[PDB]
Design a binder for these strands. Structure first.
Ligand SMILES: [Cl-]
Ligand SMILES: [K+]
Ligand SMILES: [K+]
Length: 69
RNA sequence: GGCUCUGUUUACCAGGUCAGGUCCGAAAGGAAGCAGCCAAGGCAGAGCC
């Protein structure tokens, strides 16, 4: 389960925007998204770093639920 | 070495464009700009000088 699958799942549009700012490698392997990548994605989606942190955490909550079932 | 062709490769960190999204504006309209793409660079093979 990756961010390409989470994309297919005003608040919903803003979340899709953050993923639209990522590279295919970032969508395929979300763990590589550290500080510098979060800043590029944030500014690129017109959001703040906190909004990227929230989206990545919401993905991690979903990924951990998919790993349980 | 140079030029060109071809393959491939490259998140941001002074190229272009810019879906999505963002910012300014009551509007009309403006602005910046990620990803992608183009271009460019990297690694090579080849042809020519
Ligand atoms: Cl080349
Ligand atoms: K761009
Ligand atoms: K650009």
């Amino acid at each position: 389960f990756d961010l390409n699958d989470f994309l297919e799942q005003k608040v919903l549009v803003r979340m899709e925007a953050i993923i639209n700012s990522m590279t295919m490698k970032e969508r395929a392997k979300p763990e590589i998204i550290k500080g510098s990548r979060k800043r590029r994605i944030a500014a690129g989606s017109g959001m703040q770093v906190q909004d990227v942190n929230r989206l990545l955490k919401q993905f991690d909550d979903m990924q951990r639920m998919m790993k349980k079932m």
